[PDB]
């Protein structure tokens, strides 16, 4: 009634087999970030912590250094190694003025060969909708896209977040995501922002009004598409876009 | 409020240990052509400003011979002779019926050595990104490349604008080059026409099928893939291709 078990994989496509004894409260809320350590975390497509996540204050902190999708340095995109299904995520996000990152959900560790028969990893955002997480007043990012659908929130490129209902850089938003049964919602400052159904004829046609359409990125497309997989699942995680931001009191809900 | 301090470089590869008082407005935008001096501009690769470029009606005017690439006589590419790093870069420019100019940023000044130990000038393109100047309808590069990719306000042979919304020769267009922590938009006539990323797998894919390839051209791939040093900051300039065209309305927006 206190915990309850929860899988892990520990490296790129790895099966789940380990579990953590994760605390989860009346409501059925799993605390996935215990405030100290990064267990049952690892990078998209590794096998450790990129250094540059570090934990200050009770949250988990991307130090950044500006470059933007670069991921230079020792970054990454950050995953919680758990691949879920129908649940609600609940967290804090605060980002640095002109900053960027991004929470990622049904996220696929893939990879694509190249011409010579080599892996390449591919981008976590071309299998997982992104909540985006901005500045909306500083960076540029904001004013492109259509109809604010790259401000804080959105199903980014795709579904803006209305009402826009962020608080300024530098203070806490709260996220909420949730998925059940295809059924998507955004959450912001405990608000629902938007709504939108997977794998219906209405998602492919937001995939194809996008950069992931199947005519500017056909992987991206196909990926998304199906999204999830076969088995409609995959991780949650949180963006390298190169600036500093935090996360806190990270926790989910399954639902079934 | 009303003016802001520019340090500029006087010559090859020096410091820019002099400033210049130039204005700016309230959305932050830096005139850094006032219409009436080369003040802060020099040649590439140079100490001066060269012969072929003058200053006529209110503009920068490249005095074009017709020889293409060859930069023969008193010519050779412009720098505004600030590295920039986060900017939004606008400017009007017009081109004569069958003109090719071009826009560039984030140049370096590159040299190579020979055979025999000496300095070779090395082209500002094999450094800098070109926003390409054409008129679109007579110069016969217009139809080279892949699809449209050498017309105006492309990234020359590399991403096509899409749509191609360029004036005709003798009309002018306004440009647009916003680079933030490693996004770049192009836009032309207010519209913005592509958008790429620096520094990641896409970016040297992108490099890896044009004519700065690493197999081709290996100096050139090196400091592209790399685009603007180890600081990722360089000029912005503008292109002498034999044929007369003239710039105006030049304003930089820092961003950081
Ligand atoms: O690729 C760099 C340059 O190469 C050639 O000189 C082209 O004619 C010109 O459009 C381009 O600016
Ligand atoms: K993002
Ligand atoms: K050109």
Redesign the interface.
Known sequence: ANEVAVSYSKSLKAAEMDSLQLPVDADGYITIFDGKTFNGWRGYGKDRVPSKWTIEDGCIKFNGS?????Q?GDGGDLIFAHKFKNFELEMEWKVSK?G?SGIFYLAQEVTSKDKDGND?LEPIYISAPEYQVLDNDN???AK?GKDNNRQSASLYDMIPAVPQNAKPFGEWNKAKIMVYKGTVVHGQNDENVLEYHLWTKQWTDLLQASKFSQDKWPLAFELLNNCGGENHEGFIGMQD???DVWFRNIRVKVLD
Do not use: I, S, W
């Open positions: 500006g470059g933007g999708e670069a230079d002109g960027n390449v960076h540029p990012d492109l876009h190169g600036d």
